């Protein structure tokens, strides 16, 4: 049968995931049947259809009443409760919860879904503590069907890790530094306003905003050989979507820029097809809206110094690309439901 | 002696007001002694000093500890209680509260400060219900010193009303339409997210966002002769500050653009001095950052058709110019304290 899915948090990732599944509903083992959000079904159906980044949804029709959102004649039941312990996961027969509120990233908070009736939960963010982290194309085969709470890492980890895995198995990554020139996200203020992070407090569309990130160290979670060997920061810039990763790695086997591109191109055509895209085109950020790959290598920017210092640059649609991986991971868990 | 002031809500208007008073303190009858806000004093001192719009504060030193913000050695006590009934206004000897949270604009809401010990409340927004509304330079001299809760209207009303009063007394305004091409505010969303207003739900730095406004109707509160004869809309655009009012009026006395400009110019030099500024310069929005006037008429944009259809265009720094008027009204209340 089909695994029944509930979305907790109908935000950028929650609605991107929904539109990702709608376009792949014909070939899917998942059935989205429930939504919990702080907003009502009519508001959320309006935002699902009219999206400033994705545009007006064209595939199927979207409507709503007091209780449901309707997408292509398929009814999606809705509820509004901030406490997951109160959600009707038992009554709705919910199998897998997509945790996309960004609030229940620990086993403590995420288990409240399980207490409510849900059987598994997929966290669309890095986890807090003992939560297994998975990046499709890197380690998602190591998923154990008995794990009840899992994390799909961050969008940056999903862009960096496939590149890192390829470079590591060809040249041996000893250390590595990362900087993601990142589009601003919903955790930043529109104008200078209160925030526990003094940089996220500043007007997002007016500034280059540095913030810390564990996305580079979280690569050690999915490539355990490199635990403690990668670090980095983030620079949020006034673009609404699509980001780019700048990775400078210290390498064992000496190489040159041409060979680094050949290796990643080779991987993108074979073992990493669908995860890494190799591009020799001179494109910009807008051209990667809606790209399904986790990493798009900008081959023109590759450079090596002294054989051991490698710099590679990779694009990623932090909203749509990551949401495609959330769907891929959920589809993988449905195939290994046990 | 001095009138002791507390600021409720240390946001854009609350902090702009604080800077206005810090620059004008030498000739002030008010003393800002306390701040209530969501944030701790350290976060608020950082945001007071570093402003994406107003730049680093120059006039005074600004530090903080866990208890106070120090604006030039002057200790400003800080508290963080979102229920104003619990605020220590009695203990701090508060006379006047600058209500700048945006959520206590009804009399029932604003009176919570009076229960806490405050004597008067100045709402930095339109009041909900029967709350005396004032626009400095238009009707503020009708202030009754026995009123305990007053409203300084909105920033758009403060720009439109002085221009309207001059045009009405010169030509007789019969009807009037307004559109404020407005900088986005913190009420909007950085990226597409839920909101009671489906248009404000959309990414502010990405869109032209139409929204309703009562600023044109509110002119009837301060100019009673024009009650019901004005209406308008608002278009939020991707600028962080400075807005512009477009006003098309149907007038009784036929006129021409040269006379419309001459009447506003003369009023700006006499009765409306410091409130209306007259400019024949070819400037853009950034040039009016930090302007102290409530309305800067763009004289070369004045148009008249058929003698009786008049079009005038007026700039205003919706954050700084309005905050100067909040300070102006507060000093007026201190001058007539009873």
């Amino acid at each position: 049968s089909m695994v029944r899915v509930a979305i907790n948090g109908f935000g950028r990732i929650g609605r991107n995931f929904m539109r990702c599944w709608l376009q792949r509903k014909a070939n899917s083992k998942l059935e989205i049947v429930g939504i919990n959000d702080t907003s009502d079904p009519r508001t959320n159906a309006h935002l699902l259809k009219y999206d400033s980044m994705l545009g007006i949804f064209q595939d199927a029709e979207i409507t709503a009443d007091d209780d449901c959102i309707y997408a292509g004649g398929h009814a999606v039941k809705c509820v509004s409760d901030r406490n997951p312990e109160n959600l009707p996961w038992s009554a709705w027969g919910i199998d897998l919860v997509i945790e996309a509120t960004g609030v229940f990233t620990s086993r403590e908070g995420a288990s409240k879904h399980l207490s409510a009736g849900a059987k598994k939960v997929l966290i669309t963010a890095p986890g807090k503590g003992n939560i297994p982290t998975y990046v499709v194309g890197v380690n998602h085969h190591t998923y154990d069907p008995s794990e009840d709470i899992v994390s799909n890492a961050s969008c940056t980890t999903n862009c960096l890790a496939p590149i890192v895995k390829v470079l590591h198995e060809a040249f041996g990554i000893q250390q590595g530094m990362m900087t993601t020139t990142h589009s601003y996200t919903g955790d930043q203020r529109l104008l200078d306003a209160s925030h526990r992070d003094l940089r996220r407090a500043r007007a997002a569309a007016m500034n280059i905003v540095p913030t810390s990130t564990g996305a580079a160290k979280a690569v050690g979670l999915v490539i355990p050989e490199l635990q403690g060997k990668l670090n980095g920061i983030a620079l949020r810039v006034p673009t609404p979507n699509v980001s780019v990763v700048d990775f400078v790695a210290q390498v064992e086997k000496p190489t040159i820029a041409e060979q680094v591109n050949q290796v990643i191109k080779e991987a993108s055509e074979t073992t990493m097809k669908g995860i890494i895209h190799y591009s020799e085109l001179e494109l910009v950020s807008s051209d990667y809206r809606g790209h399904n790959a986790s990493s798009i290598l900008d081959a023109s920017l590759t450079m090596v110094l002294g054989g051991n210092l490698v710099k590679v640059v990779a694009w990623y649609d932090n909203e749509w690309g990551y949401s495609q991986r959330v769907l891929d991971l959920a589809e993988h868990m449905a195939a290994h439901w046990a | 002696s001095m009138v002791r002031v507390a600021i409720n809500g240390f946001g854009r208007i609350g902090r702009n007001f604080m800077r206005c008073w810090l620059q004008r303190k030498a000739n002030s009858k008010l003393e800002i002694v306390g701040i209530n806000d969501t944030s701790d004093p350290r976060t608020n001192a950082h945001l007071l000093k570093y402003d994406s719009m107003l730049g680093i504060f120059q006039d005074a030193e600004i530090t903080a500890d866990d208890d106070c913000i120090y604006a030039g050695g002057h200790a400003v006590k800080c508290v963080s209680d979102r229920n104003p009934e619990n605020l220590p206004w009695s203990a701090w000897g508060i006379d006047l509260v600058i209500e700048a949270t945006g959520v206590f604009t009804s009399r029932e809401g604003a009176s919570k400060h009076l229960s806490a010990g405050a004597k008067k409340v100045l709402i930095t927004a339109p009041g909900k219900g029967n709350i005396p509304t004032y626009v400095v330079g238009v009707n503020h001299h009708t202030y009754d010193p026995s009123e305990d809760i007053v409203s300084n209207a909105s920033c758009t009303t403060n720009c439109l009303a002085p221009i309207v009063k001059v045009l009405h007394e010169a030509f007789g305004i019969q009807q009037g339409m307004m559109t404020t091409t407005h900088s986005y505010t913190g009420d909007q969303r950085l990226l597409d997210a839920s909101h009671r207003d489906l248009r404000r739900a959309r990414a502010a730095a990405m869109n032209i966002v139409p929204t309703s406004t009562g600023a044109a109707k509110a002119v009837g509160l301060v100019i009673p002769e024009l009650q019901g004869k004005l209406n308008g809309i608002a278009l939020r655009v991707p600028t962080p500050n400075v807005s512009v009012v477009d006003f098309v009026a149907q007038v009784e006395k036929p006129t021409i653009a040269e006379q419309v400009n001459q009447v506003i110019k003369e009023a700006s030099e006499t009765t409306m001095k410091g409130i209306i500024h007259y400019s024949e310069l070819e400037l853009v929005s950034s040039d009016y950052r930090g302007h102290n006037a409530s309305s800067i008429l763009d004289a070369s944009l004045t148009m008249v058709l058929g003698g009786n259809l008049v079009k005038v265009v007026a700039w205003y720094d919706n954050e700084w110019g309005y905050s100067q008027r909040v300070l102006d009204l507060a000093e007026h209340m201190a001058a007539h304290w009873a």
């Binding site: 702080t38 901030r82 509120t101 960004g102 609030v103 963010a125 890095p126 961050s154 969008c155 940056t156 993601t180 990142h182 996200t185 919903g186 955790d187 203020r189 306003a193 209160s194 925030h195 526990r196 992070d197 996220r200 990130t213 564990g214 996305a215 983030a234 980001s243 932090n318 | 969501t38 944030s39 701790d40 976060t43 866990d66 508290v79 963080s80 209680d81 979102r82």
Partner: peptide, 21 residues
């Protein structure tokens, strides 16, 4: 602080969101 406990009671509020991306 009272500000820190506010983000404990409202982790999804605009003053409290930290997206690690």
């Amino acid at each position: 602080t009272s500000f820190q406990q506010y983000c404990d009671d409202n982790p999804d509020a605009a003053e409290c969101r930290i997206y690690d991306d």
